Amino acid sequence: RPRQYATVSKTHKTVSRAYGGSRCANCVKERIIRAFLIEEQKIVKKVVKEQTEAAK
Amino acid sequence: ALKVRTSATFRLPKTLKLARAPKYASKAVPHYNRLDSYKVIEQPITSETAMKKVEDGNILVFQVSMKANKYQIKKAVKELYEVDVLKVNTLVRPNGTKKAYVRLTADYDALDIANRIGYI
Amino acid sequence: NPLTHSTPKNFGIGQAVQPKRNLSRYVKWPEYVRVQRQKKILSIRLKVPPTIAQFQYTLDRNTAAETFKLFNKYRPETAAEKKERLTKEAAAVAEGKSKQDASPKPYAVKYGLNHVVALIENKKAKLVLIANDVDPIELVVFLPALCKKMGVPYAIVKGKARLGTLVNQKTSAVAALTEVRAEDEAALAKLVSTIDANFADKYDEVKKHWGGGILGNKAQAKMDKXXXXXX
Amino acid sequence: GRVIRNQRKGAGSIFTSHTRLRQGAAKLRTLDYAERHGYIRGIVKQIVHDSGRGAPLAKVVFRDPYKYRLREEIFIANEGVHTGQFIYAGKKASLNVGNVLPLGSVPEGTIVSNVEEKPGDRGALARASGNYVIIIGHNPDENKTRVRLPSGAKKVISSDARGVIGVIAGGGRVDKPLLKAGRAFHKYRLKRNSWPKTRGVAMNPVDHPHGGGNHQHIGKASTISRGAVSGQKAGLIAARRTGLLRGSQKTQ
Amino acid sequence: GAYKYLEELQRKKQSDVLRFLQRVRVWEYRQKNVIHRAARPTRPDKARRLGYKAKQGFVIYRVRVRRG
RNA sequence: UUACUUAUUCAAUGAAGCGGAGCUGGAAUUCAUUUUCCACGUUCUAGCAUUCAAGGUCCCAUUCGGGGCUGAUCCGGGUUG
RNA sequence: CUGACUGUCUAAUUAAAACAUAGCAUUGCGAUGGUCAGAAAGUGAUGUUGACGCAAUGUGAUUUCUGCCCAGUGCUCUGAA
RNA sequence: CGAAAGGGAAUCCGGUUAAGAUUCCGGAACCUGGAUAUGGAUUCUUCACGGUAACGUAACUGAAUGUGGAGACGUCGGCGC
């Protein structure tokens, strides 16, 4: 119960990974993938709409 | 010229905030210490129920002021009688008097201490 | 150097938390700020009658600074000066004669509104400076035309605060000299001449014109736009 | 005579709305630079149920144009909208269900929810389960788009007023018979002390002008003039007609 | 002195000058609070008249009641 | 019948980006000129977006710390309807 | 015979066939608003609402129908004057 | 301000009185606020290792700021414990 976590040790309130508490395993996997593909495809959006720049 | 305000919000500009330098000092002569020791501890509660407590329990049972508190009770028993006070326990009698039970540390003998104070 | 990179911010809609720009335009200022700001403003739209539009005509920095450096030569008696003069005059003249006339006939700037008026009324004054900022304005509106009718050279100067310290006070409203030592009467003319061609001969023509208007910025370019564009 | 029921409702007391269980009031985003000029994305974090309002509410989280923080706005879920959808809002937005565009920026024939009367009041028209206004035309003579509200009244508003594409979710709520009385009891338990309703021709002449009896009838006309006094307004008020009709369609 | 010009001015209440002053000031007053302390008499010729001497311990207050 | 915006009236906002004009740049007319138009950061994804910002450039001798100007055009102080 | 039903009421002479109900029908209103409150108000209920809504009357489940009459009372009106 | 029935930091058995006890006695705990030292852990790859993984552990620096979770929640019923 909430205030009881203030009488307890950090290993009781985390796992060891990005988002200890907070998010759950697969929710960080999807966090990662989505992040990687978006920022990559960002450049793709950029390079491609710099091909249409030197097209006109 | 101008001035750069990064906040649309105007606020009461912090100002000096002086400090009271009187000229005729409220009270004339401060009150003497209300609740002194003799005022704190008021009277010994000598009743056969409470005598048996001093006998077989090492407890000094004094009536105390209602204004008094546990801290103040432990203090004035400790000064007025020259004794160490394990702990203090207060219950407010039905006639409004504040009965305090005081157990003395294993050093002191509360029965000795009792007819020391002068009563059996 | 190639160990630092040059990561540039976008600050366009839908990205990049906007940078602390300046909001002095958009401040929700205190009420007492807007009141004084909006009373002048209000007093800027609506046609102003001339006898108040007579003001606003202040003076040039030059004739101003000229008419000050002159007035500055006739300060009143200061505190410790009237102090000793009276320990001088009163003690000795009443221990002898000379009806207090134990002192030179003085040459001060003269001030006090009722006072400067009774001057102008009596044709005893020579050059009157009326402040352009008195409140209420009625305290003075009659002067420019009271002056004109007595033919007493006046001029509407800038600073009720200046004339003040000009007469050793916080504020003064009016300040006007009647006497002046003989070593000066020459600057008198050249000041009154150039003045009486702004505040006197101009009066009649000026009182025929009201003020006010000034749509302020937005609505004015909008009429500068309806005109420029639709013509 | 006594104070008839419909006057006692004005003071409050017993008749004020029950609002404990209500998610925050529904409102659009405040009309900021972003929406006035461009657009701004948002994710529907969840669609939720606001008590005594059949019509789901949509929670859409928008990053803060000006400060590092998230601002959750409360929309009315416009049907089709779905957890994870992206809601773009503003003059430049595109024409998809759920996005919020000014009425100028939409073609004629666009149907649209929660639209503002005066631009920036965060939503006035058609917020009821399954409703929608329709743009009937424009008119660049002051940004004023003409729309048709669910009453059928075609009222002109300013094309800078925003709406939200699509129709209000919660479709045929009033098609299912309430059946029994408890169903109705619960309906208003979450709303306001309006039910049950006693007919005033049951009353005595003191609690209603329909009141007295010897025969439950109304007495004189039950149509009362627009400008009667409270205490006589009970019945069909400015009734410009009465009786059965089946009206078909509306005002066009 | 200047007062007799304040008294006589103050009696031409529809002169274009005063109307304008009446306008700007009746606007100013509404905005300040209903009872607000007065920096200094708008009508020095009159406060004088009714007793006010411009000295310490005299206090001028403006106020706004509601008509009808 | 009607234009004005300061009285009065209403809406919001933690009074942010209103108003006028400019860089940039792509088309035009004119039988050449400025006579104007036009545009100027975000839309496959239930990521991320904060430390007066990284960069750039000047300063203090600069030991580590600061600061300024651009970065973010200028001009109105009508918060905006 | 009655009321559709469960349900409510005359605490202390009436529990019903009365009241309510769901269902049906009607009326006002798009917020500068409908209804209602207040001595007034920078006032207040509906409203954390917006016609699948709120407000106001009637009739009283289903089935089945709901005729004729706008002269009178009343309500209403993009109507001559 | 508004809950001795909602939210909520932490105690238990034994014993005892004419009448008190989850308070008293005896024993064994826990919470909180405050203190501080030693043991440990960490470190020359400075701010810990391991497990492919879900995760583990006596630990294993963290200001602004952000955010997420617990507080925190209807009713019936059968089934499991």
Ligand SMILES: [Mg+2]
């Ligand atoms: Mg106690």
Ligand SMILES: [Mg+2]
């Ligand atoms: Mg002196």
Ligand SMILES: [Mg+2]
């Ligand atoms: Mg009555």
Ligand SMILES: [Mg+2]
């Ligand atoms: Mg309420």
Ligand SMILES: [Mg+2]
């Ligand atoms: Mg809630």
Ligand SMILES: [Mg+2]
């Ligand atoms: Mg149906």
Ligand SMILES: [Mg+2]
């Ligand atoms: Mg109610």
Ligand SMILES: [Mg+2]
């Ligand atoms: Mg009820």
Ligand SMILES: [Mg+2]
């Ligand atoms: Mg009904």
Ligand SMILES: [Mg+2]
């Ligand atoms: Mg009924």
Ligand SMILES: [Mg+2]
């Ligand atoms: Mg009856």
Ligand SMILES: [Mg+2]
């Ligand atoms: Mg009656």
Ligand SMILES: [Mg+2]
């Ligand atoms: Mg009647």
Ligand SMILES: [Mg+2]
């Ligand atoms: Mg009947």
Ligand SMILES: [Mg+2]
């Ligand atoms: Mg003073």
Ligand SMILES: [Mg+2]
């Ligand atoms: Mg009145």
